[PDB]
Design an enzyme around this catalytic site. Sequence first.
Site, PDB file in Angstrom:
ATOM      1  N   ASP C  51       0.822  -1.206   0.000  1.00  6.49           N
ATOM      2  CA  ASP C  51       0.000   0.000   0.000  1.00  6.49           C
ATOM      3  C   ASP C  51       0.859   1.259   0.000  1.00  6.49           C
ATOM      4  OD1 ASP C  51      -1.935   1.979   0.376  1.00  6.49           O
ATOM      5  OD2 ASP C  51      -3.132   0.722   1.700  1.00  6.49           O
ATOM      6  N   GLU C 129      18.944   2.659  26.716  1.00  2.44           N
ATOM      7  CA  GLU C 129      18.668   1.922  27.947  1.00  2.44           C
ATOM      8  C   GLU C 129      17.162   1.847  28.159  1.00  2.44           C
ATOM      9  OE1 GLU C 129      21.019   3.329  31.311  1.00  2.44           O
ATOM     10  OE2 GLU C 129      22.634   3.827  29.913  1.00  2.44           O
ATOM     11  N   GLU C 131      13.425   0.406  29.232  1.00  3.82           N
ATOM     12  CA  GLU C 131      12.813  -0.331  30.325  1.00  3.82           C
ATOM     13  C   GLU C 131      11.409  -0.742  29.905  1.00  3.82           C
ATOM     14  OE1 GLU C 131      12.836   2.467  33.487  1.00  3.82           O
ATOM     15  OE2 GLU C 131      15.021   2.663  33.520  1.00  3.82           O
ATOM     16  N   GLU C 186      14.343  -2.711  37.638  1.00  7.33           N
ATOM     17  CA  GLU C 186      14.326  -1.264  37.725  1.00  7.33           C
ATOM     18  C   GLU C 186      13.533  -0.822  38.956  1.00  7.33           C
ATOM     19  OE1 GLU C 186      16.328   0.050  35.622  1.00  7.33           O
ATOM     20  OE2 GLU C 186      16.104   2.098  36.370  1.00  7.33           O
ATOM     21  N   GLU C 193      14.961  -3.319  32.831  1.00  9.96           N
ATOM     22  CA  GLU C 193      15.745  -2.492  31.921  1.00  9.96           C
ATOM     23  C   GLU C 193      16.759  -3.367  31.210  1.00  9.96           C
ATOM     24  OE1 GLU C 193      19.289   0.079  32.923  1.00  9.96           O
ATOM     25  OE2 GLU C 193      17.749   1.637  32.811  1.00  9.96           O
ATOM     26  N   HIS C 242      16.787   6.566  28.397  1.00 11.98           N
ATOM     27  CA  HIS C 242      18.066   7.260  28.376  1.00 11.98           C
ATOM     28  C   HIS C 242      18.903   6.749  27.214  1.00 11.98           C
ATOM     29  CE1 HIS C 242      16.446   7.856  32.310  1.00 11.98           C
ATOM     30  NE2 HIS C 242      16.926   6.734  32.814  1.00 11.98           N
ATOM     31  N   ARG C 313      19.866  15.090  40.188  1.00 13.04           N
ATOM     32  CA  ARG C 313      18.623  14.324  40.207  1.00 13.04           C
ATOM     33  C   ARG C 313      17.880  14.456  38.884  1.00 13.04           C
ATOM     34  NH1 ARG C 313      17.212   9.727  42.790  1.00 13.04           N
ATOM     35  NH2 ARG C 313      15.025   9.732  43.463  1.00 13.04           N
ATOM     36  N   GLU C 330      24.303  11.804  27.662  1.00 14.44           N
ATOM     37  CA  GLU C 330      23.145  10.973  27.957  1.00 14.44           C
ATOM     38  C   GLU C 330      21.902  11.847  28.018  1.00 14.44           C
ATOM     39  OE1 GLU C 330      22.903   9.274  31.817  1.00 14.44           O
ATOM     40  OE2 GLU C 330      21.614   7.609  31.201  1.00 14.44           O
ATOM     41  N   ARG C 332      18.027  11.903  28.659  1.00 16.69           N
ATOM     42  CA  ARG C 332      17.244  11.018  29.507  1.00 16.69           C
ATOM     43  C   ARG C 332      15.741  11.169  29.327  1.00 16.69           C
ATOM     44  NH1 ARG C 332      17.469  12.251  34.505  1.00 16.69           N
ATOM     45  NH2 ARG C 332      18.361  10.450  35.602  1.00 16.69           N
TER      46      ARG C 332
HETATM   47 MG    MG Z   1      21.097   6.200  32.610  1.00 15.16          MG
HETATM   48 MG    MG Z   2      16.949   3.150  33.967  1.00 16.85          MG
END
Ligand code: MG
Ligand code: MG
Lengths: 441, 441, 441
Positions: C51, C129, C131, C186, C193, C242, C313, C330, C332
């Site tokens: 299609d 990474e 999860e 996790e 993860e 991440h 954090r 990284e 996230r």
């Molecule tokens: Mg990480």
């Molecule tokens: Mg994690």
Amino acid sequence: SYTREDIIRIAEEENVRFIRLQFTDLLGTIKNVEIPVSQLEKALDNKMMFDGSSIEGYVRIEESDMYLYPDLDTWVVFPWVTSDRVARLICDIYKPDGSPFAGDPRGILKRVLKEAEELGYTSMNVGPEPEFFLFKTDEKGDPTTELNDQGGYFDLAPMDLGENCRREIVLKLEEMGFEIEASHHEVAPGQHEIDFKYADAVKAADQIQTFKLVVKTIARQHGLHATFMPKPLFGVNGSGMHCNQSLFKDNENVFYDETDELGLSQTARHYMAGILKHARAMAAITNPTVNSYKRLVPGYEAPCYVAWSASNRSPMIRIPASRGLSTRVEVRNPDPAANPYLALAVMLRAGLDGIKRQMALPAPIDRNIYVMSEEERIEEGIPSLPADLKEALSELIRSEVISDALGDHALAYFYELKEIEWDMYRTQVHQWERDQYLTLY
Amino acid sequence: SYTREDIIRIAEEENVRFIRLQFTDLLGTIKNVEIPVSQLEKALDNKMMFDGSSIEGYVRIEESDMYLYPDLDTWVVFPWVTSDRVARLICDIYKPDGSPFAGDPRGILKRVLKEAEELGYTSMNVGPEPEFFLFKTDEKGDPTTELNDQGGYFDLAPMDLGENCRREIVLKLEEMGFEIEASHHEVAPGQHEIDFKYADAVKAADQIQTFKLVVKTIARQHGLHATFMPKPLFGVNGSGMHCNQSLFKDNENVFYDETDELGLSQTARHYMAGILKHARAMAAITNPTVNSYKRLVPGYEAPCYVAWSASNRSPMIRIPASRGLSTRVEVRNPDPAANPYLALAVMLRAGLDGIKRQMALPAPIDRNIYVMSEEERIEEGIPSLPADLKEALSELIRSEVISDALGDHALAYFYELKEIEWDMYRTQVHQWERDQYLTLY
Amino acid sequence: SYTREDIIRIAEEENVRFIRLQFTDLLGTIKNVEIPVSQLEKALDNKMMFDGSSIEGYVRIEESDMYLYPDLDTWVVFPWVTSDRVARLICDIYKPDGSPFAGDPRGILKRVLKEAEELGYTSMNVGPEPEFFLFKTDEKGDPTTELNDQGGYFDLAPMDLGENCRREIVLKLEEMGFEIEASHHEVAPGQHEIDFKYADAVKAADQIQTFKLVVKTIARQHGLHATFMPKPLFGVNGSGMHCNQSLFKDNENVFYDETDELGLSQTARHYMAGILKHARAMAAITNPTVNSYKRLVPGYEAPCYVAWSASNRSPMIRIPASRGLSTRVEVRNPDPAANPYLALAVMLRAGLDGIKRQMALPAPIDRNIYVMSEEERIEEGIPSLPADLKEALSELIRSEVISDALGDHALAYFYELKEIEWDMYRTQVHQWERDQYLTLY
Ligand SMILES: [Mg+2]
Ligand SMILES: [Mg+2]
Ligand SMILES: [Mg+2]
Ligand SMILES: [Mg+2]
Ligand SMILES: [Mg+2]
Ligand SMILES: [Mg+2]
């Protein structure tokens, strides 16, 4: 009759506390406004306002403001055996500038009666024969599939006092002053027909509407469900509203003529011929539901064909044996779901069209029945009613008489409603299909 | 009116035993204190004390002591047909030093009426049209999802006496002396609208509050649940609480003007412009719940746009056809969950700001409807109401008129309550998400 | 690598009977065509048609015909321990005239990699990474609300062999030839993860896609349900993806620089600044679902803010301690529901925009956390991610870089898709509303 001071005095006398300013839409379902007694004077002043667009139904797009004008002659108080009594007023709908609303079914019927009076006929005597079904309810209050009784035609199955709904209906309607000619058990189990005595067109339609309301109210009271659905269950006969009609000029029945072989005057013949010619056209308004054309099937007394006869299983027009002032034309196709105002209006308009054009009445059918072929059916000139609602709508649009009778504004809205209904119905996938198919293919 | 000795005499003769020193918080829920008859004299002394911080709601941090000052003109007795009758008094809240409490909605409305009187207009005639829902309850007394009836717009579906709540509520309200203009079935199944006759602003708001209490009480008595939730079920129309308002100056309706093309005086047009300009700002108070902005969606009569029109499917403001002393301003967006005191106060304050500033009224919209594009929508200068509660709150904070009308103290607490409510709502994980997702991702 | 004859020979050896011509739409859901082995040669000819409009999703209005061009280097065979073995091929989509289809996410990623190579950087090393959540199923096969285990962060709760899915996933992905760095439990109960070893951008995205497919297949095999829905349950931490990224120029990590204080070259700083500036714009594509913005709430490790930090954090960009060839950035915020091709494409395009414009990197945040006020938050110049999907969509439209990266044709269809999704979501009436309301109002 009644007058403003009479209404006020009666309200003071009966301790009326609750008023139902009644009216009807094009869909037929009863509409109203509830008012306390302290506003009654303002109600009598022709000043109450409401949406007005409700007449167009659920397809209303632009809002209006429309006033309720009660007809004092239709005042009545319900006998519900309780304190704080309730009163009923039947109203017409008027525009804010004072002119009548074109789309009101009562307005349509009164306009057709006016154009009948202009033709010299003073009134139209109409007596309906509506039948209703009663079904046992469940715990939650919904109707189930089992009927209230299992009697046959003209039976005494609902006997005694235990859930004897028919007697209660007759007595309450009599206390309301309506003239009940008869009441009996109809063909299928659980079907009750109530015969009215003959009355003027507008008041007869009001009788039919208040009949529906009262019958349903009583049924809910006895833990039953009252339905007028034209064919609720397959395999059993449906519900018909044979209407008896006759024209009147100065308390003289024009239809009667002792010189006629059948005792029917030329005016009656023209009337019935005009009804016959526009029958397929008026089916869409006198058989308004999709379910109604499920009832027009052979084998259940249902008249599926347009021809006149004094006595036959399925002609369009039946002429009873009663003569004199009681000679009349019985049109049997319309069903209780149909709007009485609109049905009577279109019947009368087509009849006066036939009268004015002096249409030649086709020959009546003998005891001959309609097992004949379609080629034979058209050879004898016997047409048939529309197969379903779509053909009825197309015929209504193509007809120039009843489209005028309904009026330009109301015709568009009713056509739109029926198009939406049919469009919803045609695209459903019913269980019968999954029964036949889902295995064979 | 009434006086102290009249109140004492009525309590003595009527055997009143139970008194509800009643008022309202900013959240709108009815609050009160129950008192025996033997303290009634002390109640009439304006000496009863209570927490006072309850006005701030569930976010109260520091305790106060605040006195209840009843308004004797609002005395009334509930007719629940039982011994030990109960009586109602509507009270204002006062600080211990005698000054009025800034955060009381009734105080806010009276202050706005005072600043209206200082402008030369004596009063504000206000008539609401609230609607409520009836849901069948379960065995444990909680509301279920199925409605009580299935009638259409302006129907007679709740007939007879069996769980016929509309008649009973109208009659009890009339025995209160309530001026009930009408009462009818609304668009969705199970939706009941009660129309009030026009009254002064403070008395109108008290009428709305006692109306809510009366309807809910009677629904409890009938084994039903009465709700004003602005959009209880998806796919059905919500609750509208159109308010018809008009300024009165010494028994003279300032809005009326026979010289105007539409019969609206220049003061009326300034009112319209003032309400239109601050509409988005006032929505945060007149549409307070998170659920309310679920109702402001297309396709259910809900007005989602700020423009004025004499007749349209969804304008901000509808100007009825009634004229003379009955010419009025029908603002349709506010819903029954909104506090009537605050809603009327902000409406009047914004309108008076428009009157003082002589804002130029934009053109009305014709039958043109709002399938038109957003680029066109701003091209025609037709803004829209806030999408949800957060934008409503931001607009309220950015507005310098309505924040002043609510007052500095009340604004902070209302904003805090709505921030907490929205913060709770935004972080939920609803079942609709697990329906769409949890399989697709 | 592989070739046509190698594919045919392997199919002959492995008795491959079933071929999955794979690809992906803009929605991210895995799409394919199933083919018998006898057509494999024709499959290798790049002649299979389908299609094509399926790329636009369920909003397709006009039909096309589009050819599948397999990438032989992505051939792989499933180890499902059964006869009639099945093979996988990952394909690109081509127009009938031979040109690439604009709206294919893989095509988008390859175009962005081409424009990166034109800038002198050979490849983009990407390691995700992801999860996933495991839920117990009911009798009919639908996921329930109860998790598979109740372990904590980095636990050994799924032990033994009974329904021990994690080991099975690791082993089957290893037999797939995919490089698994780690696998662990996790934060919330039931969250697993899977860490991938680093790979090139296109092959990494293919790894993510086949990863999702294999994890879900195994979960269905063990009588469990595997979901990547970012925030399935309120009160538990969501699912994040991440992604570690680093630019490569001739097996030389351009990001590394021993002269830098933190060991990041100026190119890395420009890349991070470019990602930071367009963060709000790229959220709509890297956080596509409505549910995803329910996860971006404080208190569950979820980064809700645009700032870069080596350790905090909740910063937008995290720079790990690993250096040398293992220096990385990284990002996230993106969630497993986001399209990996699209997310990587927009990340890299924004980063190269920052690199070309040499954007000045703002200062990093210290251990300072974000209990600070909004006035403080803007005082330090710390923007925040969009609150929900609608704001993200508006920001995406207002952005001139990411819209170009997606391309003109794909941008319109993705915008239309997300408008439809948000329009459906905003008009729902959830149970939380009926909990809070339906009693309070
Ligand atoms: Mg990480
Ligand atoms: Mg994690
Ligand atoms: Mg009969
Ligand atoms: Mg008969
Ligand atoms: Mg209403
Ligand atoms: Mg209204």
